[PDB]
Amino acid sequence: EDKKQALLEAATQAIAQSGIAASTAVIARNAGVAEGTLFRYFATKDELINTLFLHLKQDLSQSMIMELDRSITDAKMMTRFIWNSYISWGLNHPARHRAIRQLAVSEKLTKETEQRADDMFPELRDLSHRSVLMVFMSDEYRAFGDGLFLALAETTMDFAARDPARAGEYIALGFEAMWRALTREEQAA
Amino acid sequence: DKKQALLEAATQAIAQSGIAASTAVIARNAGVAEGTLFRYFATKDELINTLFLHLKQDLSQSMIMELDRSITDAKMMTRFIWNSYISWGLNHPARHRAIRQLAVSEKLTKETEQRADDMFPELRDLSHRSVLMVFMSDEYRAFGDGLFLALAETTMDFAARDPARAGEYIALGFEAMWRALTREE
C-alpha cells in the first residue's frame, strides 16, 4: 500500500500542476515505479481520477472530524465550520486543493463516487438552507456549482497566503460571499 | 506599432505565468531585445499598469458597444455588463487571464485605478450603488475583484468547455456573483 500511497501523492502533485491531462507515465516516474505498476493499481485514468477525488475528500474529512459537532446547530454555523476547515486544508496542502478542484470539475466522476463523497459529509443535507436556484443547481449543474464554490475558496486562500495579517478577514469575507451566493433568495416586486 | 507587439506579448506571457513573467521573453516574443521593451516601459510596474489600462480599454470598448441606456434596473445593467465581460473573456482568453493577474497584483497605482474607473464611469456608479461596502472599500476592493474574476473565469471555462449550455452557465454565474457581492433590499 506504501507504493499505492506514493502514487496517489504523485498523481495529486501532477494533476495539481497539469490537470486531468497529466501523464500516467510522469505520475509513475515521480512515484518511482514504472507506468505498468500504476495501471495495475488503477485500471484507468478515470478509475484513478475517481479514487483520488475520494482519497482527497477523505483527507479533508479527516482534518475536520477533530472538531465535528452535532447536526442540531445553525446551518450557517455548520457551513462556516466546513468552509474554514476547507480553507485551512488548502493552505496547508495546496496541491491537494488544486488537484481536487481539477477532479471536481472533471466530467469524470462516477455517480458511485458522488454518493460516497456525499456520505463522507452528513452535512451535505441541504434542508433548504440553500436558495431555490442552488437546489436546482445541485440537480442540473452540480459541477458548475462546485466550480464556483472552489473559485471563491481559492481566491480566499490566495489572498490569505499573500497577506496572512488579514487572513481571518478574507476567510470571513469569502465565507459571507459564498454564503449569500448559496442562501440568498429571489426578492420580487 | 512596435509598442503594441510588446503589449500583446506581455499579455500572453502574463496570461501564462502571471506578474513574474520575465521582461526577457516578452521582448523576445515581441521580436526585440530587452532594452527596447525597457525603452517603451521603464519598469515592470509601469508596464503592468500600462497593460492593465490597454486591456481595460479593450474591454470597455467591447462593452460600451452593446449598451443601451433606456435600461435602469441595476441588476439588468450589471447582467448585461457581465454578459459583455464573459463574451470578451471567451473571445480573448489571454486578455482576460492577464487582466485578472494584473488586477489582483498589488502593483496598480491609484492613478491607474482612477483612469480605469474613468473608462466606464457608468459602471463605477453602478458599482457604488449596488455592491456591498466591504467589496468596494479601499482595503478590500482587490478581494472583491478577485472574487468577481474568479466567478467570471469559472463561468468562462464552463461555457467554453460546453458551449451548448454557455448561456445557462453565464446566467447562473451571474446570479451567483450578484447575490455574493451586492447589497440587498
Author numbering:
A (entry chain A): 7 to 195
B (entry chain B): 8 to 192
Copy the relevant paper text.
We incorporated a boron-containing amino acid into the protein scaffold RamR to create an active enzyme for the kinetic resolution of α-hydroxythioesters.
Therefore, we analyzed the crystal structure of RamR_Y59pBoF (2.78 Å resolution, crystallized at pH 8.5). A closer look into the hydrophobic pocket reveals multiple amino acid side chains in the vicinity of the boron residue, including a lysine residue at position 63. However, the lowest energy side chain rotamer in a sterically favorable conformation available to Lys63 allows the formation of a direct interaction between the side chain ε-amino group and the boronic acid of pBoF (Nε(Lys63) to B(pBoF59) distance of ∼4.0 Å). In the 11B NMR spectrum, a chemical shift of 18.3 ppm for the boron residue was observed, mirroring the results of the crystal structure and indicating partial boronate formation under reaction conditions. Based on these observations, we believe that the canonical amino acid Lys63 and the noncanonical amino acid pBoF59 residue may form a hybrid catalytic dyad, in which the lysine acts similarly to serine/lysine dyads during the hydrolytic reaction catalyzed by certain serine peptidases. The term “hybrid catalytic dyad” refers to one canonical (Lys) and one noncanonical (pBoF) residue in designer enzymes that are in close proximity and are both essential for activity and selectivity in catalysis. Likely, Asp152 has an unproductive interaction with Lys63, and removal of this interaction leads to a large increase in catalyst activity.
